[PDB]
Design a protein around this nucleic acid. Structure first.
Ligand SMILES: [Mg+2]
Ligand SMILES: [Mg+2]
Ligand SMILES: [Mg+2]
Ligand SMILES: [Mg+2]
Ligand SMILES: [Mg+2]
Ligand SMILES: [Mg+2]
Ligand SMILES: [Mg+2]
Ligand SMILES: [Mg+2]
Ligand SMILES: [Mg+2]
Ligand SMILES: [Mg+2]
Ligand SMILES: [Mg+2]
Ligand SMILES: [Mg+2]
Ligand SMILES: [Mg+2]
Ligand SMILES: [Mg+2]
Ligand SMILES: [Mg+2]
Lengths: 68, 195, 81, 224, 95, 118, 129
RNA sequence: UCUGGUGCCAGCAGCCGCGGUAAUUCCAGCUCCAAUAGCGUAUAUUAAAAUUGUUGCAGUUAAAACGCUCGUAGUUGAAU
RNA sequence: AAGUUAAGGGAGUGAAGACGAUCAGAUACCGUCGUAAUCUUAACCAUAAACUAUGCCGACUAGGUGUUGGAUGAAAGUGCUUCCUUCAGUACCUUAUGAGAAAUCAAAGUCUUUGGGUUCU
């Protein structure tokens, strides 16, 4: 059986899923068999980009407050 | 007072309809030959005065909500909230305002005025969840569930709604020291009329 | 209740409906309290008021208006019941 | 705590404007935040703190197209040991979040319980003031007053709930399908709730009305 | 179970009601339970109707109609879509 | 199809709601405003948001737009609709009532002078 | 047919009291109903009541104080000895400190405490909380 | 959820169930629990059973209103 | 309703029976014939989802819309209709700090706050 633990926000599709997500896989050998360990960590959204520069916002289109 | 009844006679506040709805029998004077029920108009004035006293007893006017659902009652409710210090809704009611604390427009009052209990039924339904003294403005076929003080009127005429709200506001101003009696209110009806 | 030493042993005393004497409990949310302002022979509202309590039962049955009318007519606030 | 009140009652309780929870039981006001109950029952400056007990966890299934779909329900009973009681329930995907939700729900439903005497009145009432009956589903329960030394004569769940409520002596009998744990807990809770509604002869005299906290603290609450 | 208050027909204050026979399948059905349809139809359609007008004497002719008054059993009626299957709350909607 | 998701419509309504004065009925002019006002990584959605904003303005000329609230329209409408008549219509020199209603006022013992029926 | 007037009277009183009616009418009256009403009046459970005179069995109008929980008869009038009161009151009454069980006794109609005070038994009539 | 043996066999199990090569339930070793000079098993009987109901059941659809009316015994009968 | 006895009657329909089709088979569904029966008079039999699957008598508790049969009181009439009130049948709609396991119920409500009278299971 497989057990899934999640917390927060994650992305699965597209190019941003390859940049902003970190992945690792390992296995542990018990006396009854072998167990698979899979970890996926979504980094803080900076992930330096094609033009070497931090892409702080992947898709958000925030609007600036007009100067008083 | 004579002239208030005169103005109520000029407008059509005294004509109801069929569907007597027996809990409203004691406010109806008679039935005409075409089947229309007539409202006494001597009890309307007295109930209006008592309603004004109940309203003025509130400490800050912001703890009062006045609601209208129909298009030709929006001007009257907005003006009444302007000259008093209450809050108005005037249209579509969000079904969780009085009972859902996480929502954006919680706005829990201490008293609530209704234009018509048959169309503002969601508002009166939610009042009984938070101990709110509903006061309404009932026609000859209105339901009286969860209604405490009922003013006999007709909810259908634009002139009727404008006149009744104007009278209530003027009386509220008299009970405060803003202007004394024997001097009429300087603002005029047709400021509360629709369109 | 008082014990044998005349010490009150209730944690609180609930209210009663003015129309039926019905002893409103702590979760009844259809119960309301009304304050009616007073005038001072000149038509302006002084600091005084009168209080009534109405239970959720009669308020759900749709009879709060008639009971309130009678209760106010007793207190010299109306001319009919 | 460092929590931001959302309702007027929360703002009033956050400051010392309300002295005891009985002040809001009297006016029949709703309670929407568990921080009020947390504030009124603190481990210090309180003789009797609240206690919890997860009485039951059961799984339920929905059985969609690709196999079943399980999730768990939690029943928790909270009690003061002196005059206060509550009961809550919650369903969720994991047991821990379910018990968290159930604990929150139990606090929000806290009620007072009236206690009385068998025979002559002496210090510290110990039993129910009169016979009470509770009902949920097909389950019916009845509780009757008992003398000083007789402990609770009832099923384990009845003993548990009456121990949270602060009652020391009672006879009981039940009818229906009591193996349904939730309905039987709810029936006991319903019977306990009815004590402060009976109008015994000593409650006949009329008293005048105190004024609501909203009216009393109108100016301070308007200052915000 | 007990999916209808009237039991599928309109009978009150009576013991027995005589039956009639289905217009399509010949079955016996009590009169108070069959669905009744009264149809006023034309002898011919609107195109062949104006051919009869201009081949006619009297210069002002009105073709007669037909009166049928058909009756059906439940099975022979809902297969021909005179009556459909409805939802639980809509089942109570008469006229 | 070319239906615009809520990402486009949310942002575009904010631009109209906050910078009403600068925006006009030309797509190119409205495009340069959006480039520096907002933050959009890709030029394809920069074009689409600006195109929607221009489409919004044309609708404004025919009146209010449901879901967009710019203050300048309400105060200009408020002054129009407060138009006081030079004399009310509440007053009529003769009160006209129904025959059955006339008895109602008479039974109560109150006097209103110019009352006549039909 | 009737077969009893006391049961109907108490049932009507109980039904009116659950609704908050402030007044109710009892169509057939009798001396037993009068004694039972007087006893409820003595313990402060109802207000005054009026007896109407038609030239048939009279009628009664009573004033209610929103104060009765229950009032019912025990139809077979079992006879009770002086030392069997305890079991009956344990079964029938809601507490040991309020409520009344009414007997008819060779010294008149009285509740169980007065019956013990007078050292007598009787037959059972009804009760009221 | 300790260690060996067996492998839908042998067996256990009042009821639900366990056992088909990694058995917390069979056969054993160790360790723990219960009552204790006492502790198991079989049959009968009481409470549990408001599952025989006077206190105190149920009868539209779960078991259950006679096809319908008259009628003797029995039971029950207005107010003074 | 079916079924039995006797005397009549006997068009249509038609358990049985005989054919023609479909089918792997078809002693069935479809079609062509057709005996008892179905109808009347005089006698038996005592059963049905003989169903509102809710025994009978009495009291109390809520608003509205109809309809069948009387009676009272008022208006449009060519001692007649429309309206109002009331009694007796009979349905439907809304809602129940009423009830149920629910479906739902104006009784299937006034039940651990348990007893109006009575028969059957
Ligand atoms: Mg894509
Ligand atoms: Mg039949
Ligand atoms: Mg072992
Ligand atoms: Mg036994
Ligand atoms: Mg037994
Ligand atoms: Mg027992
Ligand atoms: Mg049973
Ligand atoms: Mg029957
Ligand atoms: Mg023959
Ligand atoms: Mg023949
Ligand atoms: Mg033939
Ligand atoms: Mg024959
Ligand atoms: Mg039979
Ligand atoms: Mg039967
Ligand atoms: Mg019983």
């Amino acid at each position: 059986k497989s057990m899934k633990f999640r917390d927060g926000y994650l992305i699965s599709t597209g190019e941003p899923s390859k940049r902003f997500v970190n992945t690792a896989t390992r296995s542990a050998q018990l006396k009854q068999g072998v167990l698979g360990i899979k970890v996926k960590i979504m980094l803080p959204t900076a992930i330096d980009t094609r033009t070497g520069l931090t892409s702080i916002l992947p898709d958000n289109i925030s609007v600036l407050e007009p100067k008083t | 007072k004579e002239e208030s009844i005169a103005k109520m006679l000029i407008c059509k506040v005294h004509i109801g309809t069929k569907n007597l709805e027996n809990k409203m029998k004691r406010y109806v004077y008679t039935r005409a030959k075409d089947g229309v029920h007539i409202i006494n108009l001597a009890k309307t004035y007295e109930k209006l005065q008592l309603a004004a006293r109940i309203i003025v007893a509130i400490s800050n006017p912001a703890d009062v909500v006045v609601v209208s659902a129909r298009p030709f009652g929006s001007r009257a409710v907005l003006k009444f909230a302007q000259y008093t210090g209450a809050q108005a809704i005037a249209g579509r009611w969000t079904p969780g305002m009085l009972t859902n604390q996480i929502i954006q427009k919680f706005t829990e009052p201490r008293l609530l005025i209704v234009t018509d209990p048959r169309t503002d039924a969601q508002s009166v339904k939610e009042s009984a969840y938070a101990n709110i003294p509903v006061i309404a403005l009932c026609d000859s076929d209105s339901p009286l569930e969860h209604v405490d003080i009922a003013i006999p009127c007709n909810n259908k005429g634009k002139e009727s709604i404008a006149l009744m709200y104007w009278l209530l506001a003027q009386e509220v101003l008299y009970l405060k020291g803003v202007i004394p009696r024997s001097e009429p209110w300087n603002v005029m009806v047709d400021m509360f009329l629709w369109r | 209740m008082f014990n044998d030493q005349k010490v009150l042993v209730d944690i609180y005393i609930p209210r009663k409906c003015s129309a039926t004497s019905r002893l409103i409990p702590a979760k009844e949310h259809g119960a309301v309290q009304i304050n009616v302002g007073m005038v001072d022979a000149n038509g302006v509202y002084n600091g005084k008021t009168e209080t009534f309590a109405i239970s959720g039962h009669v308020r759900q049955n749709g009879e709060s208006d008639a009971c309130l009318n009678r209760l106010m007519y007793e207190k010299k606030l109306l001319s009919f019941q | 705590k460092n929590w931001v009140p959302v309702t007027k009652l929360g703002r009033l309780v956050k400051e010392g404007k309300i002295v005891s929870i009985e002040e809001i039981y009297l006016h029949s006001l709703p309670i929407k935040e568990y921080q009020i109950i947390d504030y009124f029952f603190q481990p210090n400056e309180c003789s009797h703190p609240l206690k919890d007990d997860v009485v039951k966890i059961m799984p339920v299934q929905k059985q969609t197209r690709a196999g079943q779909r399980t999730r768990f329900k939690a029943f928790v009973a909270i009690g003061d040991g002196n005059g206060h009681c509550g009961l809550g329930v919650k369903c969720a995907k994991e047991v821990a979040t379910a018990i968290r939700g159930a604990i929150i729900s139990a606090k929000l439903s806290l009620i007072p319980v009236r206690r009385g005497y068998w025979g002559n009145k002496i210090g510290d009432p110990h039993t129910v003031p009169m016979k009470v009956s509770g009902k949920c589903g097909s389950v019916r329960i009845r509780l009757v007053p008992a003398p000083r030394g007789t402990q609770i004569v009832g099923a384990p769940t009845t003993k548990k709930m009456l121990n949270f409520a602060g009652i020391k002596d009672c006879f009981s009998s039940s009818c229906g399908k009591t193996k349904t744990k939730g309905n039987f807990l709810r029936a006991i809770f319903n019977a306990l709730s009815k004590t402060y509604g009976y109008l015994t002869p000593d409650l006949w005299k009329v008293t005048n009305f105190d004024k609501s906290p909203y009216e009393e603290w109108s100016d301070f609450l308007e200052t915000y | 179970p007990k999916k209808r208050r009237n039991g599928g027909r309109s009978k009150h204050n009576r013991g027995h009601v005589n039956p009639l026979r289905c217009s399509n399948c010949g079955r016996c059905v009590p009169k108070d339970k069959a669905i009744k349809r009264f149809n006023i139809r034309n002898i011919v359609d609107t195109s062949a109707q104006r051919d009869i007008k201009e081949a006619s004497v009297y210069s002002t002719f009105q073709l007669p109609k037909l009166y049928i008054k058909q009756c059906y059993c439940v099975s022979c009626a809902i297969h021909s879509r005179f009556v459909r299957v409805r939802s639980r709350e809509q089942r109570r909607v008469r006229k | 199809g070319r239906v615009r998701t809520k990402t486009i419509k949310r942002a575009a309504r904010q631009i109209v709601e906050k910078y009403y004065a600068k925006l006009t009925l030309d797509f190119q002019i409205n495009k340069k405003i959006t480039e520096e006002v907002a933050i959009i990584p890709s030029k394809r959605m920069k074009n689409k948001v600006a195109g929607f904003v221009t489409h919004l303005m044309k609708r404004i000329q025919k009146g209010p737009v449901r879901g967009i609230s710019l203050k300048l329209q309400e105060e200009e409408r408020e002054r129009r609709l407060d138009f006081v008549p030079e004399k009310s219509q509440i007053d009529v020199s003769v009160i006209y009532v129904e025959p059955d209603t006339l008895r109602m006022i008479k039974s109560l013992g109150i006097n209103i002078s110019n009352m006549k029926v039909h | 047919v009737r077969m009893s007037v006391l049961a109907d009277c108490l049932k009507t009183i109980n039904n009116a009291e659950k609704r908050g009616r402030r007044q109710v009418l009892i169509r057939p009256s009798s001396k037993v109903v009068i004694k039972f009403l007087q006893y409820m009046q003595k313990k402060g459970y109802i207000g005054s009541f009026e007896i109407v005179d038609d030239h048939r069995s009279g009628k009664i109008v009573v004033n209610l104080l929103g104060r009765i929980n229950k009032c019912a008869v025990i139809s077979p009038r079992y006879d009770v000895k002086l030392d069997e009161i305890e079991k009956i009151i344990t079964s029938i009454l809601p507490s040991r400190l309020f409520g009344h069980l009414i007997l008819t006794t060779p010294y008149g109609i009285m509740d169980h405490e007065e019956a013990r005070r007078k050292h007598t038994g009787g037959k059972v009539l009804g009760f009221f909380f």
